[PDB]
Amino acid sequence: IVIERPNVKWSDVAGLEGAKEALKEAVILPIKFPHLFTGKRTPWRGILLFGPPGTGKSYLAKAVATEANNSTFFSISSSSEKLVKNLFQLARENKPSIIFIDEIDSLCGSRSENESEAARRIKTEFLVQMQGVGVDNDGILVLGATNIPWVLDSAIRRRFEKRIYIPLPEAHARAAMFRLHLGSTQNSLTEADFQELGRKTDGYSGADISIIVRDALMQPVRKVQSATHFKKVRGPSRADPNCIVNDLLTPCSPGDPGAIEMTWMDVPGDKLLEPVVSMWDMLRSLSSTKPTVNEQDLLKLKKFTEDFGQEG
Numbered sequence: 001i002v003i004e005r006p007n008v009k010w011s012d013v014a015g016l017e018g019a020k021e022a023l024k025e026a027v028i029l030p031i032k033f034p035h036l037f038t039g040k041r042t043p044w045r046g047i048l049l050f051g052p053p054g055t056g057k058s059y060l061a062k063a064v065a066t067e068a069n070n071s072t073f074f075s076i077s078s079s080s081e082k083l084v085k086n087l088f089q090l091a092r093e094n095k096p097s098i099i100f101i102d103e104i105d106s107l108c109g110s111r112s113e114n115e116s117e118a119a120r121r122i123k124t125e126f127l128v129q130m131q132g133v134g135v136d137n138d139g140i141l142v143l144g145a146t147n148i149p150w151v152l153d154s155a156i157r158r159r160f161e162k163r164i165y166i167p168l169p170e171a172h173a174r175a176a177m178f179r180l181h182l183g184s185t186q187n188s189l190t191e192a193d194f195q196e197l198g199r200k201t202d203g204y205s206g207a208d209i210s211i212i213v214r215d216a217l218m219q220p221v222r223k224v225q226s227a228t229h230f231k232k233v234r235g236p237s238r239a240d241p242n243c244i245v246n247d248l249l250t251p252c253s254p255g256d257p258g259a260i261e262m263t264w265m266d267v268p269g270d271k272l273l274e275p276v277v278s279m280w281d282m283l284r285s286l287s288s289t290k291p292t293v294n295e296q297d298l299l300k301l302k303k304f305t306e307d308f309g310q311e312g
């Protein structure tokens with residue numbers, strides 16, 4: 001029940017400007033401009049974010065959480081669980097409010113057979129609470145997320161009249177993720193290198209790239225741990241960036257001029273000048289990781305919208 005609002009700006013989510021606008025139109029505008037969405041224009045009660053894994057579903061929700069300017073956010077995932085009655089209640093008071101249930105395929109499991117019988121009233125204590133005997137004409141909106149939506153209950157599914165597809169990133173959005181997940185960190189990557197990576201990642205999810213950048217990111221760290229030699233160098237003081245020093249120590253090879261023998265244990269905590277993440281490190285991280293979303297996965301996703309499409 002994370003009742004908070006993290007730090008994910010729209011700017012942080014690459015691509016998805018379609019879903020962004022969809023979400024601005026059904027979640028932010030209604031809250032900021034009540035009088036617009038009154039009468040016949042009442043925002044749907046439930047939005048569902050479906051689409052392949054690692055394409056932005058949960059992440060997007062966080063963006064909404066922070067960009068949900070006035071309303072307070074509420075979250076849950078795959079986590080005696082009758083205090084669902086408690087959640088909805090909580091929200092009605094702090095209305096306007098948003099309720100986000102990540103992987104709503106949590107509260108479900110059908111091959112058309114497989115049930116934990118007490119979770120049958122879980123489905124129903126939720127299903128019922130969305131109708132509301134005390135009609136919650138509050139700014140209360142229910143968000144859902146899932147990468148296997150077809151497994152949902154007709155009753156549940158049809159509870160989300162607005163359904164948005166979160167796809168695999170187009171090339172442009174791909175390059176932008178590498179850039180971002182790197183950020184304020186020291187590196188030697190050119191705008192050209194980002195495009196080259198974007199181009200080389202045909203078919204990858206956001207989660208996949210997120211893994212790649214984290215790996216390459218860790219390169220200077222592996223090189224410092226494993227090094228056997230360090231050179232004395234010029235660079236920004238660890239304590240004061242705008243004071244250069246002729247003193248830092250960076251890892252190197254023995255076949256290097258100015259190579260002192262020692263390990264990181266010998267380097268003072270405040271004299272290490274770490275290596276920069278290079279494009280070499282990206283491609284290396286890249287080669288050793290392959291796309292997670294296969295075709296049949298994406299195919300079965302076309303199915304879920306086969307006339308299920310909107311509302312039913």
Ligand SMILES: Nc1ncnc2c1ncn2[C@@H]1O[C@H](COP(=O)(O)OP(=O)(O)OP(=O)(O)O)[C@@H](O)[C@H]1O
Binds near residue numbers: 051057060205
């Ligand atoms: N559109 C995006 N913009 C920026 N980063 C992204 C994007 N999509 C995925 N990511 C990366 O992956 C992570 C978010 O993964 P996300 O929550 O979207 O996976 P998911 O969609 O919930 O997976 P699943 O669908 O299986 O539940 C972030 O840490 C981020 O680095």
Ligand SMILES: [Mg+2]
Binds near residue numbers: 058102103145
């Ligand atoms: Mg998720």
